[PDB]
Design a protein around this ligand. Structure first.
Ligand SMILES: COCC(=O)N[C@@H](Cc1ccc(-c2cc(Cl)cc(Cl)c2)cc1)[C@H](O)[C@@H](O)C(=O)O
Lengths: 76, 168
């Protein structure tokens, strides 16, 4: 519902996203690919020291409105 | 030198905006090339409640040459040596290898990633690597890896009490 969250790149760029609590992490990376072209398989999202798993949802991490995620990349 | 200005800047920016679960301080104020890292394991992980200590050492030419990251606390982990040295690609000569654009905030975030998801392809400790892969492949049925993690964590409470730090 209605809610935005922010995603910080390693360059200092803040990417703003439109999301629902029911959205998975897998499709938030979809959200990110759409803006930055980074393939979801190399994306990694960090919140409170945790790397969020694909197939869980924003609600299971209780990520509330306007929380800022941190992006890191991994090939392998 | 550009080093000393560069380091002083990343310090103020790291203290004005910490990386969650990391605290940055100088070993001795008036030396900027050596730092102390206080590290708090996150809730709902096996590192829960734990307090960890590491040090960073910066070369004369930073940020042209990468610094060294070493744990004072003893850590069992596929990418951590016996000495406490972290093996992480971005600290050796894409955004995963060292170049003058890189910085401390980036290193930290990269280590969190490595704490979460070890590099089992090119590990520095393959006993821990084997054990981790076994823990993973068994869907949690094997407790050998996790029991070790719990114990070290439980041990850190002595370090906290000894340092006077209250663990949130
Ligand atoms: C073998 O598993 C060890 C472990 O605890 N792994 C966790 C991820 C994890 C998350 C955060 C860190 C973490 C983050 C920070 Cl910022 C500091 C520290 Cl010391 C560890 C470590 C691992 C997993 O979620 C694990 O709980 C699980 O539930 O499977």
């Amino acid at each position: 519902m209605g809610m935005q969250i922010f995603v910080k790149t390693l360059t200092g760029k803040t990417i703003t996203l439109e999301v629902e609590p029911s959205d998975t992490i897998e499709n938030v990376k979809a959200k990110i690919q759409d803006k930055e072209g980074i393939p979801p398989d190399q994306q990694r999202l960090i919140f409170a020291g945790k790397q969020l798993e694909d197939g869980r949802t924003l609600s299971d991490y209780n990520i509330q409105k306007e929380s800022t995620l941190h992006l890191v990349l991994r090939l392998r | 030198p550009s080093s000393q200005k560069a380091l002083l800047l990343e310090l103020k920016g790291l203290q004005e905006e910490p990386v969650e679960g990391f605290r940055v301080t100088l070993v001795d104020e008036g030396d900027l090339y050596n730092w102390e890292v206080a590290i708090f394991g996150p809730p709902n992980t096996y590192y829960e409640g734990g307090y960890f200590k590491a040090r960073l050492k910066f070369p004369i030419d930073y940020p042209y040459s990468p610094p060294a990251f070493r744990f004072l606390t003893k850590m069992w982990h596929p990418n951590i040596y016996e000495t406490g040295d972290v093996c992480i690609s971005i600290l050796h000569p894409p955004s995963e290898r060292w170049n003058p654009t890189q910085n401390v905030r980036t290193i930290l975030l990269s280590v969190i990633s490595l704490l979460n998801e070890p590099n089992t392809f090119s590990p520095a400790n393959v006993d821990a690597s084997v054990m981790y892969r076994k823990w993973k492949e068994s869907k949690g049925k094997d407790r050998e890896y996790t029991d070790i993690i719990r114990k070290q964590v439980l041990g850190t409470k002595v370090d906290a009490e000894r340092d006077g730090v209250k663990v949130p």
